[PDB]
Symmetry: C2
Subunit: 205 residues, 2 copies
């Protein structure tokens, strides 16, 4: 039995629709399916934008895990930014006291505009027997972010349309130093299958 903590980016950029139906909703589908492949394991979830917080404390209750998953939206966090380092640090503190267990942190993000700290956070996790993997959601080419109520798109401080890009290089550096894997999430089931197989390989270690 292993412990998996998901660190899900819920910043505004995750509402981009360059993966269907959006980055965030694709990420929630993948998590749900990830949970379905778990056996006698425990799963927790952190959400982050400018801050990070524990959305789901580490649990074997998969029915509740899916209900908590389905209620996630960017409105859970008002402060904006991409605080991957804080999320990883929170996750490392969020595992159970048991020794001898395989432990994974799965960061699901577009990796965009992270100031600094994720790489070190991932390094610190790795040296505590935790493997940090990153699932990169979005495309490097860039997409605008639709606004639900209106017919407009998200705008920066100056009032210009925001184009958000997947930053794969950032995602890759985190995963390398966190001793996990990186995979790009696209419309297929490829990312979910790749991370699920990394989980169950860790389980048989």
């Amino acid at each position: 039995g292993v412990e998996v903590i998901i660190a899900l980016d819920i910043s505004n950029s995750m509402l981009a629709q360059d993966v269907q139906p959006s980055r965030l909703e694709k990420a929630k589908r993948l998590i749900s399916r990830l949970v379905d492949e778990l056996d006698n394991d425990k799963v927790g979830m952190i959400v982050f934008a400018g801050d990070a917080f524990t959305q789901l404390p580490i649990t074997s209750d998969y029915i509740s895990a899916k209900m908590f998953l389905e209620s996630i939206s960017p409105s859970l966090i008002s402060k904006q930014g991409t605080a991957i380092g804080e999320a990883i640090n929170l996750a490392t503190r969020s595992f159970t006291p048991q020794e001898g267990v395989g432990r994974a942190i799965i960061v699901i993000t577009d990796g965009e505009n992270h100031e600094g700290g994720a790489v070190e956070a991932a390094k610190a996790a790795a040296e505590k027997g935790i493997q940090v993997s990153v699932l990169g959601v979005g495309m490097p080419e860039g997409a605008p972010i639709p606004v639900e109520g209106t017919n407009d798109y998200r705008r920066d401080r100056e009032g210009n349309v925001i184009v958000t890009r997947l930053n794969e290089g950032m995602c890759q550096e985190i995963a390398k130093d966190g001793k996990g894997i990186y995979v790009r999430v696209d419309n297929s089931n490829s990312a979910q299958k790749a991370i699920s197989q990394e989980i169950s390989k860790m389980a048989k270690s």
Copy 2:
């Protein structure tokens, strides 16, 4: 007291932006349809333009046909891209009846974006022939991306970057001023249509 009205409609790719509902182009068509409903003893013609301009509807009192010619308008009518407002205005001035003593208007409907020059001179030359050139500016000055039909993607430049298109209010205003017509911004209300129909009515009565 009949007048002659020629509409010069921008059908370049930027008119597929959806910052006015349902799009800049489709909003323009709906406005034109209502403009035609307000005509009485009048004639109407239509030109579409992007990189080139052509006559979509020769000047006519047949409003039923005018509306069905409107429906067939889309950007695929012209493949060459650009914003050839001057060419459209110049074509419009050649398209009116020869008859002297008749009020005549050219109504340019566009986001006025990336015009290379000529429009203001063209509008001035129309004005010197007694034709009043008005401009209905569609879109947001603050910019919008251009969705691609059927997909969840957006039009991209050569380098792969999302295109953002803005209404250029300044350019639209210069054209209307020198053309001796009015400038009005098109938004989601019926305000632009009523302003222009008012201008047309005012012309017919003077």
